[PDB]
């Protein structure tokens with residue numbers, strides 16, 4: 475119970491996930507995917523601690539929290555990937571150890587399309603000159619919006635709306651602080667939210683390559699983390 479103007483941006487700042495490290499040698503196909511799996515899993519753990527820290531997230535329903543974390547993990551992952559690779563054209567800084575060149579993608583099939591997508595999206599964010607604050611704000615919006623929107627017992631859908639609300643407000647706020655004119659303050663918001671669907675787009679393709687292995691996805695797998703230990 476809070477959600478203020480900057481007390482949120484600063485909060486979203488101090489809630490950020492830790493940098494994550496993976497073992498490694500070198501590399502080929504599974505070499506790239508043995509790591510990426512051990513990468514996104516370590517991260518998915520911190521992603522939960524993260525959501526947990528967004529003021530009011532735990533006040534929601536448990537099934538809703540899991541509902542939400544299940545839909546965004548992929549784009550939230552890629553949102554942080556892009557942000558880490560924003561000042562590096564052609565590269566995709568997956569982690570302090572996992573840095574991949576564009577070309578290095580083709581060496582494994584299907585993957586190369588995504589790099590083009592990420593790099594393309596990353597370049598757009600770069601060109602817009604996305605700020606650390608706007609980035610913090612867009613990341614949580616992705617988590618608060620990615621859901622299956624009732625079949626009633628609504629007090630969650632209320633609090634959730636109030637939460638997506640505060641974030642969205644902080645974001646128009648950040649843009650306003652920028653000082654530009656209302657025609658531009660609006661265009662900024664519009665340009666940044668239109669990219670979220672490109673992050674969605676890239677999120678769908680990726681998840682499609684993922685499942686294209688032999689499985690069919692972290693549900694309970696990280697269900698008992700919201701459960702008790704809260705770690």
Ligand SMILES: Oc1ccc(CCNc2nc(SCCCc3ccc(Cl)cc3)nc(N3CCNCC3)n2)cc1
Nearest residue numbers: 510511513514515551552554555585588680683684691
């Ligand atoms: O901050 C981060 C950290 C990590 C990432 C990437 C996380 N990527 C990731 N990729 C695969 S990939 C087969 C992939 C083909 C492919 C190739 C390229 C891409 Cl981008 C996606 C998929 N599989 C998984 N997981 C994690 C959860 N348990 C089940 C498997 N994660 C992004 C941002």
